[PDB]
Amino acid sequence: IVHPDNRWYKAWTMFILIWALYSSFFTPLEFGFFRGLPENLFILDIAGQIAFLVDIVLTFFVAYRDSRTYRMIYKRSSIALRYLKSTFIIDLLACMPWDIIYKAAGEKEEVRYLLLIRLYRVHRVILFFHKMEKDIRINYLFTRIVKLIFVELYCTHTAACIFYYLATTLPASQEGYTWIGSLKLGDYSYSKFREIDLWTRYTTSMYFAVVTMATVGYGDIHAVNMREMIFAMVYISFDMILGAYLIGNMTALIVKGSKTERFRDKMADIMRYMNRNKLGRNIRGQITGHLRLQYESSYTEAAVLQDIPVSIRAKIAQTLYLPYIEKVPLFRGCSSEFINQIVIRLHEEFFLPGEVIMEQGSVVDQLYFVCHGVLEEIIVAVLQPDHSFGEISILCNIPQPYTVRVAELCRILRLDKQSFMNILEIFFHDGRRILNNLLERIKQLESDITFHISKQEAELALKLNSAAFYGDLYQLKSLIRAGGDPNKTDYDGRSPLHLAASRGYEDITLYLIQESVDVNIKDKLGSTPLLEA
Amino acid sequence: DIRINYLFTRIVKLIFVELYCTHTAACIFYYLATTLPASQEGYTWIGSLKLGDYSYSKFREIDLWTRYTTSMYFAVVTMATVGYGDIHAVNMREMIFAMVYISFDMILGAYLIGNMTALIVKGSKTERFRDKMADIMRYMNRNKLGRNIRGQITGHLRLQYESSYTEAAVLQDIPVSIRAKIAQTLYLPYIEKVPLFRGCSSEFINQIVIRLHEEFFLPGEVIMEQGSVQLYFVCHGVLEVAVLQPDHSFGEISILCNIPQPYTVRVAELCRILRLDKQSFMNILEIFFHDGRRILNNLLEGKESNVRIKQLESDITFHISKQEAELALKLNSAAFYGDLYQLKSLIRAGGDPNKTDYDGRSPLHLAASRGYEDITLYLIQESVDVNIKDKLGSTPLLEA
Amino acid sequence: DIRINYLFTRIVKLIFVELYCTHTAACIFYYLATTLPASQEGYTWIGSLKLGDYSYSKFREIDLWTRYTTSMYFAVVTMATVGYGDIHAVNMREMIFAMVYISFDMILGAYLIGNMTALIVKGSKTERFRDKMADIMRYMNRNKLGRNIRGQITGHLRLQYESSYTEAAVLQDIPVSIRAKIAQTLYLPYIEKVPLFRGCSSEFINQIVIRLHEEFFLPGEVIMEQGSVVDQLYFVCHGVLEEIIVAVLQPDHSFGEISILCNIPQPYTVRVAELCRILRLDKQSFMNILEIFFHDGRRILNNLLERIKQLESDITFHISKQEAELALKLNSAAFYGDLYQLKSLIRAGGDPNKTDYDGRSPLHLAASRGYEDITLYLIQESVDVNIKDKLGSTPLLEA
């Protein structure tokens, strides 16, 4: 047993597809135009059957496809059960020779009708389109269009061979009552109609079928007798439904949309939005510039990635943004846990050349990491990739001293002020390294950074004491599970038990017992919490 | 009829109508040829017709099946707008009929094309699923990331695709009377055996099963965020610091204790979750005062294996005591007006005769305050303290 | 015009334009045959024409009515793109006109198909109904619902198929303020005729019409069962119902009001006899409205009388107890110092100056527990300070 993915059996399937195309396009030709398949084609007829014969026994080696949803069962009894119950009888009958049998039973025309069973193997070509339709590299709607064209052009080929057969089913003495026997083009007569250099006998028949299939209509070639009118009615009626089916799938391809159609809709809203607000002409040149930027070089296609869950998208950000961040001088030696908390909350933006991101004296509200392109700071400096700018303003609360100018098309990762400080506060140890690395006003910033981390420990103690003083149980609850130690004292020294015992708040006293806060803590006065009660 | 494909039954209906109008037009077109005398056969579409070799000299006694196919052959060629010119109208009465039939077929012919295009454009449910996949796959190769996360992305959207049968259904159209009966046959077994509602009133559980809203969450999704402020029930599967067994409710302590959930809930596998609105639970529990007290009583008893309940025991013990004291407050109110009907129900539903309110009072004091002997012996037979002392030193014998 | 569909009107306009251009092109085409001398009529499309036996030789005195039809017959065949070849252009000036007429009609022909598709793509009643049944059948199969219930859900969906209903998900765009007036226009006349609301105030009744819902029930269905707890109140507006046969329900009546008031389980089974239109009201909404209209609440109980004595006594006892109960709730909030808890029951509750059954102003409890903050709030309401309980004590005596 072999699974249908061996990459060698799969190459065998692509080899039998050539025979399927050949034997499906040649069976109508042999049935209609030929009356015995002369010996020039003897080898090809025999070779075609043995190629399909080795496949009729190799089908048992294939295991299975699926039982209910997905189950490849490799069992001899299971594999053969589906084969003999679905299409084995037809496959065997089609591979059995019929040309030699026709000539071995005298000349019986009724035995040549069995030769049309070979038309079933064209279904193998159709299954190829279905298999290729599930492929994601090529659009499936476009594949469905090609399938309908092949079917329509194959039925035209089959109808041309059948139509010529209806002309040969009358005696040669009555050839004047056939569509081709009585035909007369410009100078040609088509008198004998049976020795007309077949290659110019098939084109005439095919020329009739293509004109009828496209519903053009000339009248130079048309049905005359009763048995050719009936076939024309069923071929025309069948093609009318098939013709309207192609148009339906052609519309569905267009109705999906395009880049130009989506871009044109966005500009309609932006132009309407800017007109009603009377925006300046300079700003209108920037908003319209960014929309054309995303027109070509297709963007992330927003409103689609939002279906992705945040948990999965969290891993996506690490795969993409991590290599660029690690190279910045600011984050040299930082812990991996701290850096990972930054990659999750980053956003990607593009800026055209000549644009301005920051102005001199402006308050910085975002932190930008340069990942692509080049920027020039105003010329007093040049910004290279794997760098960050604006970090001076956001740390020392200094207004931005320099203007950053975009020099070439650049990709920039931005971080908000609120998100940055929340991450920085938790990683207190990492925060000290950032200030130290930035040094390598500098002394004042370094002193402030060391003073900022020193004051925050004392400030949280005051917040807890204030909440305990006013008896707000819920206010102090948030700063206990994710805040500081309630046992600590402020600058003067004031345990929450002292204030609670001074104001006679019995309820808050119970909670402090649960935290096992020490009772005999003394301030810089010699007093005890029991002394206030 | 849902069992029959809609595209199939629209083609057949339109084909039958178009093939029937063609059949009728063929019979009418031959009639216009017989309205002229036999001497003027040469001015008819069929009397002046000569195919390959046949003459159609008289177009009478011509073996009607031979005389009908040629008329039908002309009609179906113009129906499909092919056009041959071997058969065509010659005189006025056939030209006029041809104009009113060709123009009629043009409107009907364009109606078939416009009817089949609309059904092709309006694709099936599975058709729109594959369209969304192409955008994700195309974006996936734009970055060329790893293979481990590709399986999670494909599995996530497929899981919600197959579980969206209850997602925004049309059940709101059904009257609530029918819809209430549906909920009592689906969710009732699960809400009956959850340990939280053990020993609860039958009427209470009927008012809580109606408001359920089932939901399916893919594995790895965040049901709730840690440190953030809807009751949830589990039916099958496992939930994730801790693992939630089936038939166990989480988030009950958060609502009751007014504390945000400290752990983020992440789905370990494909599980069915029934959600109840947080505001709905508070409003529902308010009506059933007797049943609500038994809820946290069962929650308090659970402080044996779970560690979260043990460290929250003090706060929980306050709520039950506060609610129990409120029950005693109503007990004295009922005895004040001497309506013995309410006294029996309250004392039977866990009420105690030796229950004191905040201000030291007891039902015995209210019983003898108004001189109601009917309730006096009821508490005496209930083994109550005759000499119960209040804050102000007013014994039941004193104020009487 | 809104009476007739605009897409269908647009279809008729295109047909008129196409059939008018065909008429104009037929008159122009014959003009191109008369712009040549009579001696050269053999080079024209009609001069050289020869049908079955007719010759069209002179073609200039040919009984015009049979000269226009043969020219219109050419134009209609070309317009529909059929093509016969019996009539066709021959000279140079008729080929050029045929090229511009055929090319112009090709664009116009494809324009008709586009508008024909847009008419179909809008949808239909059958198409929308078929989509709903697909979800319901899928929903019921996965939950393994009983065969009896499946007969009811499918019945209501088919009920709204014909006699088109409100077609919900479109009226939601209407603002609630406007929709409030719509309810008073429709549901108000039906409510006023019920015996229960005889003599009720217009303000009370208006608060009921706003929060009603519309439902339909097929014959043979059951709304209430014996011994069941009633959770909805129904007003009969159309059809006839039979209560089980012990009674018959007529329009402009209400049933189930006994259960919702005395907390008694439903004693009778209500069965639908004919197609009925029913307005329903929830239990929670009904009680909230009734509590505010205390005066109207007494009238409803009195009108219902005309177990009855017990229900009447309970109704009079229910309105008596609620005044005392709200006093206890305020005192409990003041005892535990929950400022926000008592805030909600002051602006939309009872008078804080009132006392409970024993008599205890909230100032007494506040002064007993030493809650300074709550004391400021009571000053804002100007609550009397010298209120005494049935003990001789004062609020200052507890402090």
Author numbering:
A (entry chain A): 74 to 451, 461 to 522, 529 to 621
B (entry chain B): 208 to 436, 439 to 449, 462 to 621
C (entry chain C): 208 to 451, 461 to 522, 529 to 621
Question: What's the publication's text?
Answer:
After extensive 3D classification and refinement, two final maps of SKOR (named SKORwt1 and SKORwt2) with global resolutions of 3.1 Å and 3.5 Å were obtained. Interestingly, the overall architectures of both SKORwt1 and SKORwt2 do not adopt canonical C4 symmetry but exhibit a dramatic reduction of symmetry from C4 to C2. Compared to KAT1, SKORwt1 exhibits a significant rotation in the C-linker and CNBD. Moreover, the distinct extent of rotation in the adjacent subunits leads to breaking of C4 symmetry in SKOR. Notably, as a depolarization-activated channel, SKOR was expected to adopt an open conformation in vitro (0 mV) like Kv1.311 and hERG channels, but both SKORwt1 and SKORwt2 were found to be in a closed state.
Interestingly, SKOR contains an intracellular ankyrin repeat (ANK) domain, which is absent in all the depolarization-activated K+ channels with known structure.
